Amino acid sequence: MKVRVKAPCTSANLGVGFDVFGLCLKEPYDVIEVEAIDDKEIIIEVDDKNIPTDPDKNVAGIVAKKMIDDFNIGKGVKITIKKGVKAGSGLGSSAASSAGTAYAINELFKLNLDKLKLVDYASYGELASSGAKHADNVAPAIFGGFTMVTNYEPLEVLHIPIDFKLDILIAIPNISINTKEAREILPKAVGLKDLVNNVGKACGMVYALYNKDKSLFGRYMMSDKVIEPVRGKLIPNYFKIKEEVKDKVYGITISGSGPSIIAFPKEEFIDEVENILRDYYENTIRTEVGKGVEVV
């Protein structure tokens, strides 16, 4: 009763898709192992003793429990957690654990849940650990590709497979941003003009995915005037880099609530763009769209 699997990072928001859009990455990823023990305890082994190891406080511990209850495994569990990336950087670090955790269980013991259900319980973890469902990082972690959380209370997720090559460059500033503090600057109200702008550009991005038009997808992604102009201020040199790689990327925007940045470099400039990101920030990752948590 052992399961080893990869739970990938994800990038939520993608500019105009704030709180709806999610893109699953191939890397980084949390490598998680969950062997089924006999006793009734929840044991957490997580490198970087910065991640709460107490089952009720750790995200994977929360998902883990609530799922055994509902499926009455009457067993406890030990969790081997190899962190793919630092929390508070905007790459769905936590979401990776939740979805990784939930997918494990289901794969393991003959359970035959729905990817949507897994996304559901997994949210329990981002919710029971942050007070919000946030299926937007969890949904792509599970479905892979591109996802849209179009409804909560109940939960609905629309999935669009990315069948073409989409190169992705990620830069991770050695800075931390309080996900919460950057909520209050987030306006409580918006003008009709922005409703119209964001609805149009986001819809245009769905159209771009169906037409495999990366240029159109990336350009509309960078059209938000509501959240990005505010959140961007906290990211050192973000606006300057955007302008600098302007003609060398299909698009570049903040990943989740930041400070991590996600860019879609043009084939002809992947090396150069990756270098520019390395000079400003120091940590850069070259990846592409992933297919979500899969048994390793």
Ligand X SMILES: Nc1ncnc2c1ncn2[C@@H]1O[C@H](COP(=O)(O)OP(=O)(O)O)[C@@H](O)[C@H]1O
Instruction: List the Cα angle 14/135/255 in 5-degree steps.
Output: 25
Q: Does 218 bind ligand X (CB under 6 A)?
A: no
Hey, what amino acid is at 8?
A: P
Among a second copy, ligand X, none, partner that 178 touches (CB below 5 to 8 angstroms by kind): ligand X
CA distance 118 to 120: 5
Residue 76: count other Cβ atoms within 10 Å of its Cβ: 17
DSSP β-ladder status, 77-82 and 4-12: unpaired
Instruction: Considering only the stretches 89-97, 107-115, 204-212, 261-269, report the one whose residues sit in contact with ligand X under the rule CB under 6 A.
Output: 89-97
Site string for a second copy, 117-156 (x = CB under 8 A): -------------------------------xxxx----x
Contact status, residue 56 vs residue 94, Cβ threshold 8 Å: no
Is 92 annotated as a binding-site member? yes
Residue 150 CB burial class (10 angstroms; 0-12, 13-18, ≥19): exposed
**Which residue(s) pair with 252 in the sheet?**
263
Among ligand X, a second copy, none, partner that 58 touches (CB below 5 to 8 angstroms by kind): ligand X
Q: Output the smallest distance, CB 163 to ligand X, in A.
A: 27
Among ligand X, a second copy, none, partner that 199 touches (CB below 5 to 8 angstroms by kind): a second copy
Residue 290: count other Cβ atoms within 10 Å of its Cβ: 23
Among ligand X, a second copy, none, partner that 93 touches (CB below 5 to 8 angstroms by kind): ligand X
DSSP β-ladder status, 167-172 and 261-265: antiparallel
Q: Does 16 bind a second copy (CB under 8 A)?
A: yes
Q: What is the DSSP string of 9-63?
A: EEEE-TGGGTTTEEEEEEEEEEEEEEEE-SSS-EEEEESSTTS--STTTSHHHHH
C-alpha dihedral, 40 to 45 to 50 to 54, nearest 10° = 0
Contact status, residue 90 vs residue 136, Cβ threshold 8 Å: no
Among a second copy, ligand X, none, partner that 129 touches (CB below 5 to 8 angstroms by kind): ligand X
Instruction: Considering only the stretches 35-43, 112-120, 180-188, 235-243, report the one whose residues sit in contact with a second copy under the rule CB under 8 A.
Output: 180-188
The answer to whether residue 126 is catalytic is yes
Q: Output the smallest distance, CB 21 to a second copy, in A.
A: 8
Q: Output the smallest distance, CB 129 to ligand X, in A.
A: 5
Contact status, residue 252 vs residue 263, Cβ threshold 8 Å: yes
With respect to a second copy, which residue has the nearer C-beta, 199 or 296?
A: 199
Provide the sign of the torsion angle of the four alpha carbons 187, 190, 193, 194, taken in this order: positive
For a second copy, the binding residues in 184-213 under the rule CB under 8 A are 186-192, 194-196, 198-207, 210
With respect to ligand X, which residue has the nearer C-beta, 129 or 198?
A: 129
Q: State the number of binding residues for a second copy (CB under 8 A).
A: 36
Hey, what amino acid is at 88?
A: G
With respect to ligand X, which residue has the nearer C-beta, 94 or 197?
A: 94
Site string for ligand X, 32-71 (x = CB under 6 A): -------------------xx-----xxx-----------
Is 132 annotated as a binding-site member? no
- Strand, coil or helix: 198: helix
Contact status, residue 231 vs residue 254, Cβ threshold 8 Å: yes
Is 86 annotated as a binding-site member? yes
Could you give the residue numbers annotated as active site? 126, 179
Q: Which residues bind ligand X (CB under 6 A)?
A: 51-52, 58-60, 81, 87-89, 91-95, 97, 129-130, 178-179, 256
Residues in binding site for ATP? 86-96
